[PDB]
Amino acid sequence: SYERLSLKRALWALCFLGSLAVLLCVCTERVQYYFHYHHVTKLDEVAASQLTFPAVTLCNLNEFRFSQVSKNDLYHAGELLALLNNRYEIPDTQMADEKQLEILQDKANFRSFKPKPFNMREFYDRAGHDIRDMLLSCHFRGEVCSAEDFKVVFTRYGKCYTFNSGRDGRPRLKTMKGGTGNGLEIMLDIQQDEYLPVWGETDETSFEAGIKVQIHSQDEPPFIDQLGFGVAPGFQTFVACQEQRLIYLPPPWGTCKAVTMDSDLDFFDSYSITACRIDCETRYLVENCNCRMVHMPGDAPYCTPEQYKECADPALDFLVEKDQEYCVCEMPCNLTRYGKELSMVKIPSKASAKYLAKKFNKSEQYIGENILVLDIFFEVLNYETIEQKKAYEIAGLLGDIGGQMGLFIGASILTVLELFDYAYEVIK
Amino acid sequence: ALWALCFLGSLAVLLCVCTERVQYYFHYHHVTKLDEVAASQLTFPAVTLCNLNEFRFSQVSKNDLYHAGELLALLNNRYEIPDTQMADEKQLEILQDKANFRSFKPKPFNMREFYDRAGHDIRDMLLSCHFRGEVCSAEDFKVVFTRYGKCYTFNSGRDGRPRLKTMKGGTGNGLEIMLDIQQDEYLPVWGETDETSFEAGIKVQIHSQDEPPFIDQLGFGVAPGFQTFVACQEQRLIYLPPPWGTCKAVTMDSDLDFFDSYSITACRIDCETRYLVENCNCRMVHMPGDAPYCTPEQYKECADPALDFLVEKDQEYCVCEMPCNLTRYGKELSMVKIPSKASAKYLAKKFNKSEQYIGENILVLDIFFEVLNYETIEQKKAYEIAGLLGDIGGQMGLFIGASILTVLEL
Amino acid sequence: GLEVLFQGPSTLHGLAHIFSYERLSLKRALWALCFLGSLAVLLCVCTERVQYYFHYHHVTKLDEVAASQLTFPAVTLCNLNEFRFSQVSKNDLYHAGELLALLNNRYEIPDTQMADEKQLEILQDKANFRSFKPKPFNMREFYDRAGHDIRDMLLSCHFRGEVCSAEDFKVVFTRYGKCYTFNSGRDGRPRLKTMKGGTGNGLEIMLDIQQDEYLPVWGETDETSFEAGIKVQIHSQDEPPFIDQLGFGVAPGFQTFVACQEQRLIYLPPPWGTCKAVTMDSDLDFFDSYSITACRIDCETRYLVENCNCRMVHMPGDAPYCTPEQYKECADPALDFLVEKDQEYCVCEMPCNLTRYGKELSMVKIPSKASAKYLAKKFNKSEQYIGENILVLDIFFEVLNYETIEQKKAYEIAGLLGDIGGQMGLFIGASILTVLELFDYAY
Ligand SMILES: *[C@@H]1O[C@H](CO)[C@@H](O)[C@H](O)[C@H]1NC(C)=O
Ligand SMILES: *[C@@H]1O[C@H](CO)[C@@H](O)[C@H](O)[C@H]1NC(C)=O
Ligand SMILES: *[C@@H]1O[C@H](CO)[C@@H](O)[C@H](O)[C@H]1NC(C)=O
């Protein structure tokens, strides 16, 4: 009855409770929502008049030219190239090209042979196809290039070449037009006849003739085993690109790493998912095998054919399957990638067939089995942008709670005085 | 007193803004969230593949040619070989003897059996198979009848067996098969008919296991004499039901007579099947159900006309809405020459075929993930009910807050 | 109940007394403190919401809407060889010899002996100018006469299984010369529609690229390429073909499947974006309808006329066709200038409404052994010729489904006012009591 006696104090009392109820709910909802850290994406295109041409890494599918494999190399690495068994003579199986095998007989004869020093990197450098031999003609945006414009990079395919690498303090090339002309355009000889011969199915061996190619930002090392595409001989292969600029959101909204002036990677200048994974592979091999593979950076010693077989390969195989967690290599926030439409036509035309052959002193046959043209260019001089945009920033959370907090405080202040007014009366 | 002027003015404003936010709610606006999320495993997809040649020439018996001669377009409706200006005299000669019905008593015939017997055999075609470096064989392929005939789905997820997973991406770490398309068993063509094409190779569909193959429409071509790399990206799509969108609410029951799991493909096959049974009292070899297989006559005289009627001229019979939850695959095709000169002589010896044969018949198919990374594409509601109610909380904050202020006067 | 006696200790009643003398100033001081605090909040959030409005934020809405019909696109296709060797007359060789690079600027066949003795012998005869009186010459006429004839190239044509002929292909001059757009939508004729997608149910053509009519090549020049095949652009009918830049290559000896997806884009004008608001007024000298392609051709044309008092064969306008001389000495250099050294001259922004096409290229061999013998006899050619010259092109829709890609306004005016309204209306409700004490005291 002291409560009942309220005489419409009690309605005031409950209505303030009703309002404090409402305020808690709305403020909960808007704060629960803030914390899902919702985002949505903004697609756009914006025309440029210049575009920075990408890096173009390209590898022959054949790792080692047959000719350049010395008796010494065969002695150290014979088992690794699977040209020899574990007993360093020529495997039993008889499927082999008797003329080509004859040359391996001679090389693999070790009677009274004194071993010389051997180094995997040197072997790859010497034996790997030479851009100078492969590259029959080169034109960037109609201008002549030669082998001088190709920087050597060791990959898991061996001696490869990045064009417009942006390395060695030379400037990154730019296209001012789209279309078939205004790009890189190269004629390669894949030198099919220097291919390591295959007479037995092995874990190692393949039937491919051609090249793999990666188009990539200069701020990114080539990871061509995984990300590259195939170009076959006997076709001009057009590769129309679209530049794509991605902006992703860090945690808590997303997962990206903020690229800055400090790379945060032992062995590289710029953070990229590729750079990160190579850094990781390299660190881990050094740590667990006290050596690195030819294509890894650092001062460490190159693995010997035995450490390749008995330490490195097993360890890397472990790293991926049974030690996944060891290396989180998350995406950067700022990033540039390239769309690609492959299309092709036959090379050479009948009209041009007889000429090419004469000009390089090769059979017409050879041109059809060995010669390709690669036409990398921009379809359009414009880049697509793909931004993740925060759906609800703090400015908004406060905006929405803010006005309600300001008038609930105002009302609760009024209730403090009616509780002192009630107290005063009771007190007396 | 004066608060009449203010409180009405304010309640005016608040009722307006409250209707704006309700009109907005009812436009049921959405926008999309693209994301990439790195996984360490990925479920490898289903890979259905068909020879472009439906029936091996060898396996086509005199009896088959008698019943289905007009269907294979090897014969006209008079059981005669159409007058050819000039065919391959060698190939023609073998049709002469097959199509000779002197003394011939017709034996029993069944389209399904014909397809099963005559269709290319995976066991003949599949020279070499490797998943993730491991050996596979014909046991890892499941037969599916499609509108191209006897085809094979790899990693089907059917027959109990578990769905395979890639733990790394690249050229190696997926399916890698060497096929012989058996060019020499191709039905011969001496004249132009509706059926006549000039294609040699295979069609391939990469698809979710939760989805039957629709390879006539969705498959892509792979040529012989090339290793064709097919770098995929897994894409997980989430679409919004009505009123925001038109996707079909994903539930436990298929809502299709003949299929376990709802797919745009499953739905269209179900539809085609129901309609043909209803209108033609039979089904085609590749359709499910207990119905009787159509005879070559019903194929020609009932089924083909009915299907062709259904699509253009009877659109409305078949509403096959998209699932909300689903999985698709991006593809980059690229290719290199097969075999290399170095490897040419070996392949030939190893399969007892000419080097010639290898160049016209042998292909390699390399399906894999470019990166172990799935892209997500969600339609996300722009204004949920939780929010509209949140904002009319604005109205209750004045309503309660105004009445409390009125209690001070009285 | 001692608490009732003396009515609470003196200490307390005295407190209660201070309260009551002070109350009227607490009430005022608190409302001053609170009303200011609230008006502070209101001014801030109302600023924030207006700053945000003016960044004119947008975000994008992807959807896939099914349909039962789709308008089939335009398909422009060009032979990669610009001029058939046969149709090159003595007169043409005289005027344009240098342009086709069959002659140097000295009216001789470059000293080179690298060439086919048989094919060279026919150039000797043509390029003999002894006693020769030149006739009149016109680049457009030369292209029209010498360009490959669709009627010769097109061995078989089927739209959705129905037969088509050369009559169904409209001629367009491009920078590759005499080319052909199928389902152009020009000349009144209606735009074709597929009612179902898949390998059959679209355009399916067999071409002979006529390899043996290719201009012969013995010496490296800018024009010299070794390509044999065709380039193809799939494009909306509302858009001229820009096939040098946007086309893709199709090789002979393969059936090339080209599975398309229709894509409808809606982009936002300024201030949100940069697109050109659709008007039926083209605002383009030479075209009916705005496209980025139409705009760039218009520009190229205006600029060349302006700088070179002539146009190239493929450009519109009434201007005179450039002579082989003006092509070499004026036009090519000027266009090259326009792009590199005069970038800013030519502002060709994207339209807001438009339609694009996704493409998956895939291929199989042609012809099958079974069909090899037939094709050869049916066209009176070696089996050799079929493998080097014959291609099939299969353009179709993968599914009857268009994808929509809309930029949508993130914060429209309805919202800005709604929110500034809600805050202004919420502050009024709270500060009601302070309004009266501001008028009471004022009184
Ligand atoms: C980094 O991203 C921001 C995004 O606003 C941009 O201003 C800048 O040019 C980018 N720079 C890079 C990739 O280093
Ligand atoms: C789709 O199905 C999967 C099966 O595990 C489920 O986890 C998922 O929540 C569904 N996707 C969405 C976002 O509804
Ligand atoms: C063009 O105008 C508007 C939107 O910009 C819309 O109705 C539709 O997307 C377009 N309509 C056409 C091309 O008929």
Side-chain angles (χ1 to χ4, degrees):
Chain A
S1 85
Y2 77 87
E3 61 209 332
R4 299 275 297 162
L5 186 138
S6 44
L7 187 40
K8 318 244 289 159
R9 285 260 187 68
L11 73 75
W12 166 308
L14 65 81
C15 274
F16 168 94
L17 244 47
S19 92
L20 167 141
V22 153
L23 170 70
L24 287 175
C25 303
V26 305
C27 276
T28 282
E29 187 267 319
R30 286 302 170 197
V31 169
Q32 289 183 326
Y33 193 78
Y34 176 66
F35 279 176
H36 295 156
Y37 284 108
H38 287 304
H39 65 247
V40 59
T41 80
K42 178 210 208 162
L43 296 154
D44 205 25
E45 307 169 32
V46 288
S49 46
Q50 274 199 344
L51 264 177
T52 302
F53 200 81
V56 172
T57 308
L58 57 97
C59 303
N60 204 309
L61 286 168
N62 193 60
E63 296 191 57
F64 309 109
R65 294 174 286 178
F66 189 57
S67 96
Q68 297 297 302
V69 174
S70 85
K71 179 183 300 302
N72 185 59
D73 304 331
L74 211 65
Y75 173 88
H76 285 101
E79 207 196 358
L80 207 72
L81 321 195
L83 295 158
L84 300 182
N85 44 63
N86 60 335
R87 311 227 275 97
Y88 292 82
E89 196 47 3
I90 303 97
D92 203 45
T93 50
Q94 279 302 139
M95 308 275 202
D97 191 331
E98 60 169 29
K99 302 279 192 200
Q100 216 186 341
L101 167 145
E102 180 75 24
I103 317 160
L104 186 70
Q105 311 277 34
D106 174 28
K107 281 183 177 151
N109 199 305
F110 299 127
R111 291 206 321 144
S112 198
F113 168 78
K114 287 237 158 182
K116 277 86 199 154
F118 183 78
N119 176 40
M120 277 307 271
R121 164 178 217 68
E122 185 276 328
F123 175 54
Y124 273 98
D125 203 354
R126 175 165 38 79
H129 288 256
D130 198 325
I131 186 64
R132 253 140 50 203
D133 291 344
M134 282 190 299
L135 178 53
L136 303 201
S137 144
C138 182
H139 295 263
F140 190 73
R141 218 176 44 185
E143 320 280 64
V144 175
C145 29
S146 70
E148 282 60 47
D149 314 58
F150 285 89
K151 187 264 170 65
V152 174
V153 40
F154 290 92
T155 68
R156 198 164 278 102
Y157 286 70
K159 191 177 192 175
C160 304
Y161 306 91
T162 310
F163 172 84
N164 187 35
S165 43
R167 300 169 193 181
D168 299 322
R170 274 145 51 75
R172 301 180 177 187
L173 275 45
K174 321 202 174 183
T175 279
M176 270 147 230
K177 289 196 65 78
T180 181
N182 288 271
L184 180 59
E185 185 174 48
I186 54 159
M187 188 179 287
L188 287 165
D189 177 357
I190 65 167
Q191 299 184 291
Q192 271 245 45
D193 52 13
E194 288 259 43
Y195 273 42
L196 263 45
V198 318
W199 60 80
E201 191 190 328
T202 308
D203 304 23
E204 218 283 321
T205 220
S206 157
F207 301 100
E208 300 143 316
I211 73 178
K212 279 178 105 68
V213 176
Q214 177 170 13
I215 292 158
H216 60 104
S217 171
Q218 287 92 355
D219 302 321
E220 178 178 10
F223 211 66
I224 189 166
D225 47 345
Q226 190 168 323
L227 269 71
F229 59 86
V231 172
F235 304 76
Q236 173 150 166
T237 312
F238 310 105
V239 191
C241 310
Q242 175 150 62
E243 196 179 74
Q244 287 176 289
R245 295 214 226 290
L246 275 70
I247 324 295
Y248 281 133
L249 283 176
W253 299 268
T255 315
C256 73
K257 250 184 70 84
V259 194
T260 67
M261 282 281 160
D262 207 298
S263 102
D264 231 39
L265 291 176
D266 298 6
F267 289 115
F268 287 108
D269 198 355
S270 310
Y271 188 81
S272 47
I273 314 104
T274 309
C276 179
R277 284 180 71 198
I278 299 168
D279 189 80
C280 175
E281 271 180 43
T282 314
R283 287 193 278 106
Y284 184 96
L285 247 171
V286 154
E287 194 58 44
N288 298 144
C289 283
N290 309 293
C291 77
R292 70 173 159 128
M293 291 165 108
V294 300
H295 68 265
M296 313 195 163
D299 58 353
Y302 292 123
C303 307
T304 63
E306 207 149 60
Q307 301 174 279
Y308 254 99
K309 199 149 224 165
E310 274 175 299
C311 196
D313 286 303
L316 288 174
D317 259 323
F318 178 84
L319 170 54
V320 298
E321 74 206 4
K322 274 150 197 143
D323 196 1
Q324 186 57 248
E325 42 263 294
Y326 172 95
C327 259
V328 181
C329 272
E330 55 217 335
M331 190 178 287
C333 305
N334 260 17
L335 182 151
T336 291
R337 47 196 299 283
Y338 294 97
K340 302 190 297 288
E341 298 218 347
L342 270 66
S343 49
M344 53 218 92
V345 298
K346 190 178 170 178
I347 188 177
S349 66
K350 279 171 66 188
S352 54
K354 199 193 151 269
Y355 165 47
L356 267 180
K358 284 248 185 169
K359 171 159 171 230
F360 296 107
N361 189 14
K362 321 274 185 153
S363 58
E364 286 200 22
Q365 184 174 349
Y366 188 83
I367 304 307
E369 296 179 331
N370 287 259
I371 298 305
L372 62 85
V373 164
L374 180 55
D375 207 358
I376 297 147
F377 56 92
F378 285 120
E379 208 166 352
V380 173
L381 272 211
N382 80 30
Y383 65 85
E384 191 183 320
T385 71
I386 322 179
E387 277 157 70
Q388 288 172 343
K389 306 296 286 197
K390 316 191 223 260
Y392 201 44
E393 229 155 338
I394 197 63
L397 176 62
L398 296 183
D400 291 51
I401 63 133
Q404 350 292 308
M405 296 295 302
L407 79 77
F408 178 80
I409 188 192
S412 86
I413 291 312
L414 270 301
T415 301
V416 181
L417 308 196
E418 264 298 321
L419 186 56
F420 284 168
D421 280 6
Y422 171 92
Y424 177 113
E425 288 166 24
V426 158
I427 284 155
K428 178 173 103 310
Chain B
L2 185 49
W3 67 271
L5 193 275
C6 274
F7 161 97
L8 290 178
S10 92
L11 179 56
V13 154
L14 265 67
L15 252 38
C16 304
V17 308
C18 275
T19 47
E20 188 268 320
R21 281 308 169 197
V22 181
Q23 287 191 359
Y24 194 101
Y25 176 65
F26 281 169
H27 285 158
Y28 284 108
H29 292 298
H30 68 249
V31 292
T32 77
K33 318 193 164 166
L34 278 65
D35 200 33
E36 295 207 317
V37 341
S40 48
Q41 267 182 359
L42 271 174
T43 293
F44 195 85
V47 175
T48 307
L49 62 95
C50 305
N51 203 309
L52 286 168
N53 194 60
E54 296 193 52
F55 307 111
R56 293 174 286 176
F57 187 45
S58 96
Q59 297 297 306
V60 173
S61 85
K62 179 188 304 299
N63 185 58
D64 303 331
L65 193 60
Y66 175 86
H67 285 101
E70 205 186 0
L71 212 79
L72 321 194
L74 293 155
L75 298 181
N76 50 70
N77 49 321
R78 283 269 263 157
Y79 305 72
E80 275 153 32
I81 305 169
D83 305 55
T84 299
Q85 175 51 217
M86 304 166 249
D88 190 337
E89 293 183 1
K90 300 267 231 161
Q91 215 169 12
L92 182 154
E93 186 166 5
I94 308 170
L95 188 68
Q96 304 277 45
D97 189 30
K98 280 187 175 154
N100 204 309
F101 301 126
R102 192 88 36 72
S103 308
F104 173 77
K105 302 192 193 209
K107 292 183 174 188
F109 183 78
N110 179 312
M111 273 314 277
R112 165 176 215 69
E113 185 275 330
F114 177 54
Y115 271 100
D116 203 355
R117 176 162 38 78
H120 288 255
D121 195 332
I122 187 64
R123 216 156 42 211
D124 292 339
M125 282 195 297
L126 178 54
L127 305 200
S128 149
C129 183
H130 293 265
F131 189 74
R132 176 164 48 185
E134 299 283 76
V135 176
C136 30
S137 69
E139 286 131 337
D140 300 318
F141 289 85
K142 167 60 156 63
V143 173
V144 40
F145 288 81
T146 68
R147 225 161 163 262
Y148 281 43
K150 189 176 196 177
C151 304
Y152 306 82
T153 311
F154 172 97
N155 186 36
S156 45
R158 300 159 187 164
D159 299 322
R161 271 158 48 76
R163 301 178 179 192
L164 274 46
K165 317 203 163 205
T166 281
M167 193 170 272
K168 155 170 64 271
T171 177
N173 184 336
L175 182 56
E176 185 171 332
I177 53 171
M178 186 176 264
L179 293 181
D180 177 357
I181 65 166
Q182 298 183 288
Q183 271 248 45
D184 298 350
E185 290 262 39
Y186 274 42
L187 260 49
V189 303
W190 60 77
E192 268 188 17
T193 181
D194 197 353
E195 211 275 307
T196 279
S197 87
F198 300 98
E199 304 139 331
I202 72 185
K203 225 81 178 302
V204 175
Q205 176 171 12
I206 293 160
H207 60 105
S208 174
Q209 286 92 354
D210 302 323
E211 178 177 15
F214 212 66
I215 189 146
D216 43 348
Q217 274 211 358
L218 295 172
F220 60 86
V222 170
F226 303 76
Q227 172 148 12
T228 315
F229 311 104
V230 189
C232 310
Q233 168 145 296
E234 196 178 75
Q235 309 211 319
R236 303 211 217 289
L237 277 73
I238 321 298
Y239 281 132
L240 283 176
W244 295 267
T246 52
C247 74
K248 208 226 189 231
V250 210
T251 83
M252 162 49 225
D253 68 314
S254 101
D255 292 282
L256 301 168
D257 295 359
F258 297 107
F259 290 105
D260 203 342
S261 189
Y262 184 94
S263 336
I264 321 100
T265 310
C267 179
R268 280 183 70 198
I269 299 167
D270 191 276
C271 173
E272 271 164 37
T273 308
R274 288 190 288 98
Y275 180 99
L276 190 55
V277 158
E278 277 170 36
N279 285 297
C280 285
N281 308 294
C282 76
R283 70 174 161 124
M284 292 163 95
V285 302
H286 68 263
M287 311 195 118
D290 296 6
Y293 287 131
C294 305
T295 64
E297 217 191 299
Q298 300 174 279
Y299 257 83
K300 193 130 198 164
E301 291 290 46
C302 197
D304 172 63
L307 181 156
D308 265 309
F309 185 87
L310 177 51
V311 302
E312 89 260 12
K313 187 59 189 302
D314 192 358
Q315 187 58 53
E316 182 60 76
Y317 267 35
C318 205
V319 182
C320 275
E321 343 193 326
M322 190 168 35
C324 300
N325 198 4
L326 80 79
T327 295
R328 297 176 171 185
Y329 293 98
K331 303 189 258 263
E332 240 213 296
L333 273 61
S334 48
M335 39 205 87
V336 300
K337 179 64 190 153
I338 295 298
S340 66
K341 270 202 138 164
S343 55
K345 196 48 205 171
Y346 160 96
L347 266 184
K349 288 249 179 187
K350 169 154 165 187
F351 296 108
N352 190 12
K353 324 272 183 161
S354 58
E355 288 195 24
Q356 181 85 101
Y357 189 81
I358 305 300
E360 275 157 21
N361 287 259
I362 299 304
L363 63 84
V364 164
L365 181 57
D366 206 355
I367 296 151
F368 57 86
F369 286 123
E370 208 174 350
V371 195
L372 268 189
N373 231 306
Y374 68 84
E375 190 181 323
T376 69
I377 311 169
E378 299 137 73
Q379 291 174 339
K380 279 313 304 136
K381 303 181 174 180
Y383 201 42
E384 300 167 321
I385 195 69
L388 183 61
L389 296 179
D391 290 346
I392 69 96
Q395 190 72 58
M396 202 163 163
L398 167 134
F399 175 83
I400 306 296
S403 86
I404 295 309
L405 180 147
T406 291
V407 194
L408 258 196
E409 299 192 323
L410 305 187
Chain C
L2 282 209
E3 77 292 312
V4 147
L5 315 161
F6 64 99
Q7 199 78 295
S10 56
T11 63
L12 176 60
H13 300 90
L15 216 144
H17 180 67
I18 312 216
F19 178 51
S20 83
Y21 165 64
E22 295 283 14
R23 172 159 88 252
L24 172 70
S25 27
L26 259 191
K27 301 228 153 134
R28 289 186 149 208
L30 270 41
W31 298 1
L33 194 91
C34 164
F35 169 96
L36 285 176
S38 214
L39 166 137
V41 152
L42 164 69
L43 290 177
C44 302
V45 69
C46 283
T47 281
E48 187 268 321
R49 294 169 205 282
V50 175
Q51 306 276 13
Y52 194 77
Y53 176 67
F54 270 42
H55 289 102
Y56 286 108
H57 287 304
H58 69 253
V59 295
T60 77
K61 175 164 170 261
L62 276 63
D63 213 2
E64 301 175 33
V65 341
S68 47
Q69 282 206 342
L70 277 170
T71 292
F72 197 82
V75 176
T76 308
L77 60 96
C78 304
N79 203 309
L80 287 169
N81 194 60
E82 292 203 317
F83 307 111
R84 294 173 287 177
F85 188 53
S86 94
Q87 296 297 302
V88 174
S89 85
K90 178 183 300 300
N91 186 57
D92 304 331
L93 209 72
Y94 173 70
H95 285 102
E98 201 196 350
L99 210 83
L100 320 199
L102 294 172
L103 299 179
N104 44 63
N105 81 345
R106 297 179 27 152
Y107 294 76
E108 42 194 45
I109 301 172
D111 199 47
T112 53
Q113 71 291 47
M114 307 280 89
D116 177 4
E117 57 164 332
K118 313 274 188 198
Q119 219 187 340
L120 169 142
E121 258 166 27
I122 319 162
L123 279 182
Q124 310 285 42
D125 172 28
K126 281 184 184 151
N128 197 308
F129 303 122
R130 295 142 36 74
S131 91
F132 171 78
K133 285 159 148 197
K135 275 81 162 199
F137 183 79
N138 179 314
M139 274 315 275
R140 165 177 216 68
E141 186 275 329
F142 176 54
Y143 272 104
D144 201 0
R145 177 164 38 79
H148 290 255
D149 194 331
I150 185 65
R151 223 147 47 219
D152 293 335
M153 281 191 296
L154 178 56
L155 304 200
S156 144
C157 182
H158 296 263
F159 191 74
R160 301 163 65 179
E162 298 310 313
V163 187
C164 29
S165 69
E167 283 60 48
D168 306 318
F169 286 83
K170 182 265 176 59
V171 175
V172 40
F173 287 80
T174 69
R175 221 164 163 190
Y176 285 131
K178 193 177 191 173
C179 304
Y180 306 93
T181 311
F182 171 97
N183 186 36
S184 45
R186 300 165 199 162
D187 298 320
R189 276 147 56 78
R191 311 199 168 180
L192 274 48
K193 331 206 169 211
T194 204
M195 178 83 76
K196 68 176 179 192
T199 179
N201 314 300
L203 183 58
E204 185 170 38
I205 55 153
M206 186 177 268
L207 292 184
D208 180 353
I209 66 168
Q210 299 175 205
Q211 271 243 44
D212 52 11
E213 289 258 44
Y214 274 41
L215 263 41
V217 40
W218 58 80
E220 291 272 20
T221 71
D222 52 13
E223 195 272 336
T224 62
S225 83
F226 315 77
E227 309 132 345
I230 73 185
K231 278 178 102 71
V232 175
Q233 176 173 8
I234 294 161
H235 60 105
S236 172
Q237 288 90 358
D238 299 324
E239 181 198 335
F242 211 64
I243 190 148
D244 38 3
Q245 278 214 12
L246 293 176
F248 58 87
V250 169
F254 303 76
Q255 173 147 170
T256 316
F257 312 104
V258 190
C260 306
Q261 172 131 51
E262 195 177 76
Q263 306 208 318
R264 297 213 225 290
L265 276 68
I266 325 295
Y267 279 27
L268 284 177
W272 296 270
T274 50
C275 75
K276 195 181 188 300
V278 178
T279 307
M280 189 169 287
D281 296 317
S282 101
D283 261 323
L284 277 199
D285 283 343
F286 292 116
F287 287 81
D288 305 292
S289 320
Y290 189 81
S291 47
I292 316 104
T293 305
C295 181
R296 283 190 62 207
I297 297 170
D298 189 84
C299 181
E300 268 184 30
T301 308
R302 287 193 281 103
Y303 189 75
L304 207 61
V305 156
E306 189 183 326
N307 285 61
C308 288
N309 307 293
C310 76
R311 70 171 153 123
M312 291 167 88
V313 300
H314 70 264
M315 311 195 162
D318 52 2
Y321 298 115
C322 305
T323 64
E325 265 277 27
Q326 300 174 282
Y327 255 83
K328 149 162 159 185
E329 278 277 284
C330 196
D332 282 51
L335 289 172
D336 259 325
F337 188 92
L338 173 55
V339 128
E340 254 135 24
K341 286 161 216 75
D342 198 356
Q343 186 58 57
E344 182 182 323
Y345 169 97
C346 190
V347 191
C348 275
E349 57 215 69
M350 188 193 167
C352 302
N353 267 356
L354 83 162
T355 294
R356 171 208 168 288
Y357 294 96
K359 310 178 317 274
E360 204 200 45
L361 271 64
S362 51
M363 40 191 92
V364 300
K365 193 173 168 189
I366 295 296
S368 67
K369 272 183 196 295
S371 56
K373 178 61 197 149
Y374 169 44
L375 268 177
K377 283 202 91 272
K378 170 158 187 206
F379 296 107
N380 191 13
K381 318 277 183 150
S382 58
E383 306 205 4
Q384 174 76 261
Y385 187 98
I386 304 299
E388 299 178 327
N389 286 259
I390 299 305
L391 62 85
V392 169
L393 183 56
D394 208 355
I395 297 148
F396 57 94
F397 285 121
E398 209 177 350
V399 208
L400 296 179
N401 160 308
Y402 71 83
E403 191 175 321
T404 68
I405 299 147
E406 298 139 77
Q407 293 172 340
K408 300 302 294 175
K409 305 179 166 83
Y411 200 42
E412 204 154 1
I413 198 63
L416 183 273
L417 297 176
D419 278 321
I420 205 135
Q423 197 75 37
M424 187 238 187
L426 181 144
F427 169 82
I428 259 60
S431 282
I432 292 285
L433 294 145
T434 303
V435 180
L436 314 187
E437 286 267 46
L438 272 200
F439 290 168
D440 273 5
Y441 178 61
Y443 182 53

